[PDB]
Amino acid sequence: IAALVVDNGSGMCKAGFAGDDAPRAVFPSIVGRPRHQGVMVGMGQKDSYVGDEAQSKRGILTLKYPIEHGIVTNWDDMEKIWHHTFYNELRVAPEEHPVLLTEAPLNPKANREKMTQIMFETFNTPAMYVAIQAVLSLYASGRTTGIVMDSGDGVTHTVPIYEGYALPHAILRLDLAGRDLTDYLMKILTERGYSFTTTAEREIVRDIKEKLCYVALDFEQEMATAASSSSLEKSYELPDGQVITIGNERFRCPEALFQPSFLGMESCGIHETTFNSIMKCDVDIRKDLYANTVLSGGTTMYPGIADRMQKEITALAPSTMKIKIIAPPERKYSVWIGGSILASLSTFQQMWISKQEYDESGPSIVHRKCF
Amino acid sequence: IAALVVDNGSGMCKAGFAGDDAPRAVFPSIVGRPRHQGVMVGMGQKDSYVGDEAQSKRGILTLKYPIEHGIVTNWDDMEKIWHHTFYNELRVAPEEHPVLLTEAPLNPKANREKMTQIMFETFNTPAMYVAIQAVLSLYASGRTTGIVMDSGDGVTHTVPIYEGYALPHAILRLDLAGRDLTDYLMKILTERGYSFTTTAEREIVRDIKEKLCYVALDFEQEMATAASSSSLEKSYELPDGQVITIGNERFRCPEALFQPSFLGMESCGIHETTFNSIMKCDVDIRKDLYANTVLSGGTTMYPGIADRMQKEITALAPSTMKIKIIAPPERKYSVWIGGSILASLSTFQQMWISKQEYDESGPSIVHRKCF
Amino acid sequence: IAALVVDNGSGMCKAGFAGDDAPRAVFPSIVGRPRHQGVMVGMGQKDSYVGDEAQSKRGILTLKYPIEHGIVTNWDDMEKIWHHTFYNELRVAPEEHPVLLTEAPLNPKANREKMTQIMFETFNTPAMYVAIQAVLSLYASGRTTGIVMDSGDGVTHTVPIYEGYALPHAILRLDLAGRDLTDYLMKILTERGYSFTTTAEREIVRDIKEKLCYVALDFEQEMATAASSSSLEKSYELPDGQVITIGNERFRCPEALFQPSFLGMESCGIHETTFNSIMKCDVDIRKDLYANTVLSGGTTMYPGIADRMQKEITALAPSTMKIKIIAPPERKYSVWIGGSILASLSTFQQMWISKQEYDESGPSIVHRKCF
């Protein structure tokens, strides 16, 4: 039987069977409910739409993300996401196949506990493992020594991993993520009088970000150009047909990854957290990391972010280093791909916790393997 | 020479010289135009009317407010308002006195720029400034540490400003306001038999709103009190002298401030936007902010609102914490009171942008010290 | 047992059993009394008249409608209309058959209650429901995302519905309707010296309406043409044989729907109450509802009204939006048709208010699903 691989991303759920080269199910991790009383009873409405359903019916629903910064905040909402993942999106009985769960680094013990409990007892999975997302990210490029800079909708994190072993004390988390950049995008679009408030409107702003924002290579000269010619500014049209112009705002939004001060976060920028994790690594190995900075997760998709990460972390490194930013295509779903790779293998076939083990030993098996 | 302080509220304009403790002029901010052909050539009638002249002629004019949600939706009717503000209501030449305007948080950047051009190139002011409405208020409260819930006819803002250093990232703007509740009062009064439609009737509804309506301390219990008894029934005479008996309506009309789901907006109640604004700030200052919660603007004048506020945030906030809704009498004009203080506070005398500066740096000068 | 579907509309009461595709009764919702004292006593002349009996004796009668602007103004003469509706037009005993009554949006709570009192206690109906007339026009067209513009004699209302959930915060009721349009035709007919004043004469002018007014696609062009040449003028013979003639008045009469200012009201036209209603709902739920403007009720029968709605609302809506005016055949009677459809559903057997419920709950039962 083929194990099931699920990337529990904060914004989108990527899932499939082991050995697929790309995820089968790729959908926004949304649970919806209706904002108004239902009146055409002959329609036969259902009380909570999920995934692409909620995104289809958008403006009659309140939209809930159950995962905030990797923390599962609402469990019955997340349980419905997994129910839909299994019975509808993949069409499989999860009690008959082993399951691979991705998880974010430095995420509290209880999240793994409740994930475990729900898998082993709501879905009765037969065997299971929970992988540190960055491991899978590095593995996805086929390399086995580097530092990963992961940056999803909910978490940005830096993990050094050498000869395939992680450095746990040298990990960093920064919660400034894709949602936060959507937040700041609202605020700056408000300057040109484009207000967006409802969750539905939030999704419009997410769409806008995903197609007109880009990482400026040279912020000062760019912003001087933006104050000198309209040629850097362009437009997009709403689901309401009307056009909206995105301008200075284009670059100002993604600039925040390097300047978290712009969202009033004192926390260091992504170039600083990568550097500050390399400098937490043992003095020997820093070279091996500089040739192997791998980017992963969807907010690493901004045009020019690689160029900026390079030209920035260049300044943080000493001169005479091969500072090479590994930013391929498929970085989008890389984490999942790595899951599928690792899942296919007899060595990893030792790692999966048997349901029976958990059943007999309680949470005491997972309380170890979470490190 | 004495400067002028003018608050461009979406419903009523408040203006006067600095130093005074109440704003001399209050023209309700309305422009209105003849709804029919003028027939008596001997009357000496005029093209359009404003403020209390518009109120006097009300039953024959279409009424337009040229500010909505704080945005100046029409510039010619705003400029008419300023012409009447200065040369008719205050009998002062604005080209001989510095002037301070007021503006809402998060309002579109273009608004400040147009206002500035109209002041410097219609009214030829010597020097100008545009204070952020909330800010002025804490000055009006004395206290330089606190969170201001300003709620007028148009906007609602919840700035927290600490140790006198702001926290702009924590600002929340909720477009539920007094106009929105006037509009909702029309809908609920229909249920008992009363029709209001015209712009002129909107002002009669406003009068009913300013007299008989009040905030329930507990909606369900007071609801039930109606359902059991006539005890909350009170009556108001229209201009016809016919009495209209309204009830179950008073503690419903403004219950919208705590349940915007009644009016088909999505965002949480003014108590929830208060708590959530505090929760955006760095975790130390919260103790001091809960003890310095300030109310301002005419829609904070509902009887019972303080009690409801204090209990509502006492539910949301921690136990073993103290909640102080500082809500004085005269909370209403607690802006042209703060602006009076600010123009009097002689250390501020460098802040007024000079006409010569604006004539060199163009509209870009207005973005000096704002959000 | 079969249900009875009765629409008490301000001009006519459409009644019949469920499941049928047209009503069995279509009588003017009029009661009449003699205007003069009687002499030929062998006639046994009736204490009052109703429906087409009132059209038969019409010239010797004072006539009244007990329904105006959707409010029942006279419960005695309305009870007469219901007594005739059942016991003469359908010859049914209502005490043995469930009844679906139709009601207007945003109408006083007392009307649902006083109706229900008469239905359970005079007519002893075994079960009842009071459907929103807008919802029924949507069921009548089979669609379940759209905006219903319904207008007969008493009320014009626009109600958007999406995936069968209501959008109640976006309902607009403009009391410009067919009765008013008849009043206005009487005023403008007076311009050519054709005079009509009695309630019987009023209904002759109703007849002219039905067969002589079109809603020009451009009022300036058509008014210029009708001032330029006589070719457009058509004639109509009174019951007294002489030929009236209608010129500019043909299209001026329903032009009021697009310029209510001709009738003294401040309100924007039916195109504007449609556009403003679509703008009251979320951006998502919009392009869809711009492809689905669904018309209903007898004042939607004017030639060219669908063209005029399109060429008007397309000038209000954004470019690159598809606007379509679904104006079906039998828009005249859609609601009966919609009510017939709703009474055909098995699940609607769970929606009814039963007399056993009413006797135990009291009047508040009538309000569970209403606007």
Binding site: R192, G193, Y194, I244 | E68, P108 | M279, V283
Partner: peptide, 7 residues
Amino acid sequence: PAWXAXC
């Protein structure tokens, strides 16, 4: 509706 797009 006061703003440009959006309300």
